[PDB]
Design a protein around this ligand. Structure first.
Ligand SMILES: CC(C)(COP(=O)(O)OP(=O)(O)OC[C@H]1O[C@@H](n2cnc3c(N)ncnc32)[C@H](O)[C@@H]1OP(=O)(O)O)[C@@H](O)C(=O)NCCC(=O)NCCSC(=O)CC(=O)O
Ligand SMILES: CC(C)(COP(=O)(O)OP(=O)(O)OC[C@H]1O[C@@H](n2cnc3c(N)ncnc32)[C@H](O)[C@@H]1OP(=O)(O)O)[C@@H](O)C(=O)NCCC(=O)NCCSC(=O)CC(=O)O
Lengths: 411, 427, 427, 411
């Protein structure tokens, strides 16, 4: 029941942008080695033919023209050590991969098997032809039950994860006939000096690659995405008796449970990373890598068998924020899973706002690519809006045993 | 005398030709969803091609081609690789044609039962039943219509269709003639790697024009132009000019149009052979006297003189040279000594629409009308060259001053044209 | 009246149309080195195909087709499997056409500088440059020639080209016209297995005809026929008649002509819409009274009498129904109430030469000539039907009695014709 | 250096034959299971393109129209136990196979490896589609030297081997510009009545074959064409000192040599068949099987102990000819290799008369298909007219043993 019949095409901005060079910020070039894979499942995909889905992509790329641009480099005729990349806003466009899968969509959603976000997203990267590689791929998979899955392959260079989701929802609003919110690309980004030669302990200095923006891990990753229910969420609120704590019960407890499950299997996962998709730290810009990167350590007893309330109160309080030194660094930095197990806070991100016509999605899962060999944990919202969806990117030798360790608590 | 002068008004009046009036035309403006930028073309080429020599060639061709960013390809060349099917070729012929006749019958009030002559030309795509039968089936035209479908005749077949409709309106009085001039790019895409057949990939774009001619004298107050002359010149007798634009198959079996490197030397000699025929027809006798007095003193005074052919800028006010490429309008300008404003409809048409084969002259006419430069009594010169090197030329005379809101293919973009087209676009 | 007859004597001779004379024509006789018998065609079909449901269908089609053993295919369908190249189809076009014009310029005394108008038609094959440009390159015709290449218009485009050359000879006095009507079978072949597309494999054969028309009065005593009328009828407005002879692609990607099972009912109704136009033109008004002495006593007494159709055997001496298939000549005989001697040129043309699409009427005319049946003053009716269901018809009138040594395509084998044709071919 | 690039094509008669039915003889239906493989090698095929070679085949088949027909079957008048075939003269044609070989021809002629006649003749058969199988295949193989090889695959039903050779020579005479002699088909063949229910001991009655006229062998057959020279022919004439002989000194000595050579390999081949192409037994007809098939017994000592002179003495005179009882038998028989070893006398046959423009062939070898597992000896003429050529069609178990057993006398 594999996906087959991939037909490649392109959508461009309907208006000519011109000879525009979109400058990338210092936080954009730090997240350039990572890639977002998001799948949006729909129960009925009739009436959404692939001209109906593609015609609003031409006014949507008028507002988001750096997503249709291409990566170039600016020449430096002094010393050859700096060459800052930018987005040359030619209207090269966004890949549209029409595919079809002759399996059932609802049976594949409840499969809980390692590997559905790779078959439903076009697994490409800003690759060895860097100057001619698209920044966004949209795969439209039609199922035999009438279902529809939109798989978005978003480069973390051009935008964040809430920036990616808002960019997709602004296409869904044009397709629904609504008027989208205005996109702010207006203040251009400038480079920063300050001379930080020491990388933070939340990131891992990988080698100075030049034209392939991907780090191979050696062990193949697999996005196992399980579901955290409402009953086990408030069951995790039964370990904080007699104390008050600022731990948000839907992110710190869930990521602490996954941290406990990973550290039960590995030897010592002492330091972790929290990459928060906060909203108060956002500017008005629509394509900006404004996360909140920071490292949390135990600083004492090992987190392998302590209870998850202690790790939740430890993660919500003892975070040492490092989001500015990651951007102020000069080399390739590999934040997502490079040095430590990342715990991402994609829970206030409007995933289910991809209402196509009046059709809210049945299930939305987000994976990643380019994750280093420590792991990434993506805590997402649920369809009803109360539970959590946790996609875990791990080297494959552990997901057979995370399902054994997490199932004792998730029932 | 006073009684036998009716022999003058019966021999001269019944020997004059019927006037042919261009009532209106309608050029198909392609949508912005079908546009192909430079980077989209050079990435679609780079994904299919294993040869990295062909992309370095097509980069230079497309960047010195004189085209722009609004040039439109059909919705089958937007796939990687393209799908040049016949159902996709018929879907483009039902799109570029049926949207240019719908634009024409809504601006003229033309009835489908008024059309008496139908002359359609498309060079490469010629299905069975023909495109004229497609227009007859869609618009439900009459059973006794004189329909013709001229295929294989290249980019100069627009004026062949105009000459054919003109000669058909001499025999049939009180008639309307519909002329459709298109080119279907879907079966014309070359899927191979020969460098002489990769130039029509980087030039030919979507476009069509539906043209309404008539010999009715009632449509002389409504018509925009009057056809003065059509001059045809077929250079096919030369073996070099016959195989200049030649449709071959390469060593892998892919059919395509193989352009020659000797094309500008042939198109210039096919134009100056056409100039010697249209010269005594349109040039004023105030400066036609060099062929009457100054050629007497060649074997009388001197052999070897100054380069001076008569000025066509005194004959016409507007020029509509066919927008083939950058180096062809550059070569047909110095052969006529034209100002940069004279070659401006051709350059901006090649920039905006690309090399639409048979409809470039009507896109250039719509450019001149959109700028408000088409005044009453102005004479237009439409030069078209093609394959077999037929190099046809037509002279229209404007009957009424065109008001600048035109509702043509240019009205969404005429405020920014003319664009200062660089010699090589920035890479 | 003694002096006011010169005003009538000059208003009548300047309004009378120019006569169009058929000087001579030459039909291509294909050699016996290209003949395809029944058994050779069936073994060629049985080798390349696997299913015995298509071979048993093509056996019945070819044995009920009414063809013979001297029918010729190009030198690409003699290979197993065939080789439909572009050079192999262009070299066939240089064989059927150039051997028909060489036969015409040696029997007329025609000069290549004397040809003013060139109208070539071929339905499917339309290369770039045209077949007309191929003729211009080969025979070195003039640069001011008015060449037209009507492609995609099916098997009735021979009379479209005849009416086009007629309408061009009214505008241009003292001119010769060259009409070439051919069909290139090398790209016409179907490589798939759809049953409605395998009927053109079993019908169409090699053939061409070069026709010399003129309007000069010097070539009015050498000429053979005078063109009286050409009557066109386009049934393309109907959706059933437009998609009758339709070029499609099957589900495996092979192009071909797909004939409809309802084609014979449409071909009969395209003729009766053509009979109603040509009827008042050619029938004598001794018995054109069927609409004034017979119709006026109908809608007050009784609508509908037992049928007495207008007898077209009183208006014409010879009939040249297009040799499409055996069943189409069988039905248009019973619609016109023809004797078997009237449909003898069509039957023996389909037997000897097969369905040469656009040029069957000239093989039929050469049959009527080479039997010694073309006397002076005989009126000829050529009925030709094709795709889009254009059903064109032409009335020629014989000027001089043709002597039976004719030097045509029939003189090698007309001592055996008419052959008695049983309706099956037993195997 | 194998043969490749086969392109198939047909040549029909130029004049329509009509509904003619060529009646087969009782001798033509006795040889229907065998076939002929004749290869004619040419040094220089310049100007001989596969249009110049194919154009005289259209006047050549106007005279030889049964060769361009197909084989059918007539129905019985009472009970349907017999069904005598006939050649229905529909102008279906003769196959032309244009092939090429990148090996040089002068190396391949002097190679002595088995399997050369199989590659240069199109190995087909009146086979599983009997009503739609050609009676003649002509393969034209272009070599690296420019050398030409005409490989004629002739069905032995329609004619004999001298009938095949004169039928090819009458095509080469039309090709060379000459005028061929008269093709006589004027007396039609008719069945006979002789009441013969017992098969002769010179053939092998195979079982009922309906729509495949080829008896399979089961082993790997191999045709090994070795050349017997003039000097070894005169060494064979020194063994009748004081003895009167009636053996023709170029066939019975050579076929006796091959007989004792294979008798030293196989156990006991006591009797052999001689298929003489006798010039006096031929009638005027151009497509007829006027062979002389008869066995010859040892009637004494073993043929592995004795020498070739007494073998030729018993081979000349002790032939019990059964060429009427071969044609008179009802069931299908196997002549070549069926019961005993066959020693064919294809030596007065004008093999080198295939002068196509002005060019004598360099080398002509004839093979056979459909030979049973006992063997066939084909004693052919050489180009000089003095020496001979012997093609031995044996199974591959004893081909390499025959090259050693014959090498003691051939030097
Ligand atoms: C002139 C141009 C190549 C661009 O100018 P340049 O400055 O780049 O030219 P250049 O001297 O630097 O060299 C360009 C490179 O391309 C190669 N090159 C140029 N023309 C070529 C041709 N016809 N065929 C094969 N190769 C060609 C050159 O060898 C050279 O290769 P290298 O790099 O090795 O040196 C191009 O704009 C052009 O060809 N314009 C003419 C367009 C045209 O022919 N239109 C006809 C439409 S007729 C029609 O419409 C009728 C019909 O369709 O039927
Ligand atoms: C009438 C014939 C089918 C033969 O008569 P038959 O006695 O065999 O007919 P029949 O009723 O017994 O059945 C014939 C078998 O073939 C099938 N059959 C018949 N016509 C078919 C068609 N157009 N398409 C697909 N199948 C068809 C039937 O299904 C049937 O199959 P089953 O056994 O299962 O029932 C054939 O001779 C014929 O088609 N003549 C008309 C020729 C014609 O169409 N010419 C068009 C050229 S116009 C042109 O030239 C213009 C252009 O090309 O541009």
């Amino acid at each position: 029941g594999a996906v087959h019949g991939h037909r490649l095409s392109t959508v461009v901005p309907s208006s000519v942008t011109g000879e525009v060079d979109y400058a990338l910020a210092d936080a954009d070039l730090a997240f350039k080695l990572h890639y977002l894979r998001g799948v949006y499942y729909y129960r009925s995909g009739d009436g959404l033919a692939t001209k109906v889905l593609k015609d609003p992509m031409f006014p949507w790329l008028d507002d988001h023209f750096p997503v249709a641009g291409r990566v170039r480099r600016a020449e430096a005729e002094g010393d050859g050590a700096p060459r800052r990349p930018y987005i040359k806003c030619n209207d090269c466009g966004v890949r549209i991969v029409e595919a079809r899968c002759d399996r059932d969509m609802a049976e594949w959603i409840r499969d809980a098997a390692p590997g559905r976000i790779r078959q439903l997203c076009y697994d490409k990267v800003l690759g060895p032809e860097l100057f001619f590689s698209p920044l966004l791929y949209v795969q439209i998979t039609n199922f035999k039950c009438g279902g529809l899955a939109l798989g978005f392959s978003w480069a973390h260079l051009i935008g964040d994860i809430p920036s990616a989701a808002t960019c997709f929802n602004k296409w869904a609003q044009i397709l629904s006939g609504k008027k989208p919110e205005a996109t702010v690309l207006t203040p251009p980004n400038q480079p920063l000096q300050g001379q930080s030669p020491a990388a933070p302990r939340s990131v891992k200095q990988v080698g100075p690659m030049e034209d392939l923006w991907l780090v191979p891990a050696g062990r193949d990753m697999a996005c196992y995405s399980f579901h955290v229910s409402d009953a086990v969420l408030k069951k995790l609120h039964q370990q904080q008796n007699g104390r008050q704590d600022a731990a948000a019960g839907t992110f710190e407890l869930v990521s602490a449970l996954v941290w406990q499950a990973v550290a039960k299997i590995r030897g010592d996962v002492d330091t972790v990373t929290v990459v928060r998709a906060d909203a108060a730290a956002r500017s008005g810009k629509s394509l900006a890598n404004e996360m909140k990167v920071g490292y949390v350590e135990s600083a004492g007893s090992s987190p392998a068998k302590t209870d998850v309330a202690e790790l939740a109160a430890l993660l919500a309080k003892n975070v040492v924020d490092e989001t500015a030194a990651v951007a102020a660094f000069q080399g390739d930095v590999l934040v997502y899973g490079g040095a430590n197990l990342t715990l991402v806070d994609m829970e206030q991100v409007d995933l289910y706002g991809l209402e196509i016509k009046g059709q809210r999605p049945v299930y939305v899962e987000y994976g990643m690519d380019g994750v280093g060999d420590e792991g990434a944990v993506l805590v997402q919202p649920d369809a009803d809006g109360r539970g959590r969806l946790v996609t875990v990117v791990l080297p494959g030798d552990e997901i057979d045993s995370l399902r054994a360790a997490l199932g004792s608590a998730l029932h | 005398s006073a009684f036998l002068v009716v022999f003058v008004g019966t021999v001269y009046v019944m020997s004059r030709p019927r006037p042919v009036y261009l009532v209106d035309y309608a050029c198909y403006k392609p949508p912005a969803s079908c546009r192909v930028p430079f980077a989209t073309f050079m990435e679609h080429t780079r994904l299919i091609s294993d040869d990295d020599k062909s992309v370095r060639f097509q980069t230079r061709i497309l960047e010195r081609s004189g085209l722009g960013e609004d040039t439109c390809l059909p919705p089958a060349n937007h796939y990687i690789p393209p799908n040049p099917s016949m159902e996709a070729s018929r879907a483009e012929a039902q799109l570029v044609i049926f949207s240019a006749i719908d634009d024409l019958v809504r601006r003229t009030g033309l009835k489908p039962k008024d059309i008496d002559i139908l002359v359609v030309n498309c060079s490469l795509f010629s299905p069975t039943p023909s495109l004229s039968a497609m227009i007859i089936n869609k618009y439900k035209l009459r059973s006794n219509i004189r329909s013709f479908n001229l295929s294989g005749m290249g980019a100069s077949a627009g004026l062949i269709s105009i000459d054919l409709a003109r000669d058909m309106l001499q025999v049939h009085p009180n008639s309307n003639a519909l002329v459709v001039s298109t080119e279907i790019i879907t079966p014309n895409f070359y899927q191979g790697s020969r460098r002489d057949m990769l130039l029509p990939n980087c030039l030919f774009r979507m476009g069509a024009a539906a043209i309404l001619l008539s010999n009715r004298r009632r449509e002389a107050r409504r018509a925009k132009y009057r056809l003065v002359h059509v001059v045809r010149t077929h250079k096919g007798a030369d073996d070099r000019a016959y195989r200049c634009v030649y449709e071959e198959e390469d060593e892998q079996g892919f059919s395509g149009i193989s352009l020659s490197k000797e094309l500008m030397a042939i198109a210039g000699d096919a134009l100056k052979s056409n100039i010697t025929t249209i010269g005594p027809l349109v040039l004023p006798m105030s400066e036609q006297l060099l062929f009457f007095f100054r050629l007497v003193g060649r074997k009388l005074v001197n052999k070897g003189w100054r380069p001076y052919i008569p000025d066509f800028k005194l004959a016409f006010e507007h020029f509509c040279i066919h927008a083939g490429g950058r180096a062809v309008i550059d070569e047909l300008q110095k052969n006529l000594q034209l100002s940069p404003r004279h070659v401006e409809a051709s350059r901006m048409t090649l920039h905006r629409f690309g090399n639409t084969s048979s409809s470039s002259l009507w896109y250039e006419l719509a450019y001149i009308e959109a700028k408000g430069r088409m005044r009453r009594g102005d004479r237009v010169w439409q030069i078209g060259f093609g394959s077999g090197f037929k190099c046809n030329s037509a002279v229209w005379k404007c009957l009424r001053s065109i008001k600048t809101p035109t509702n043509g293919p240019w009205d969404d973009c005429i405020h920014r044209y003319p664009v200062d087209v660089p010699e090589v676009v920035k890479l």
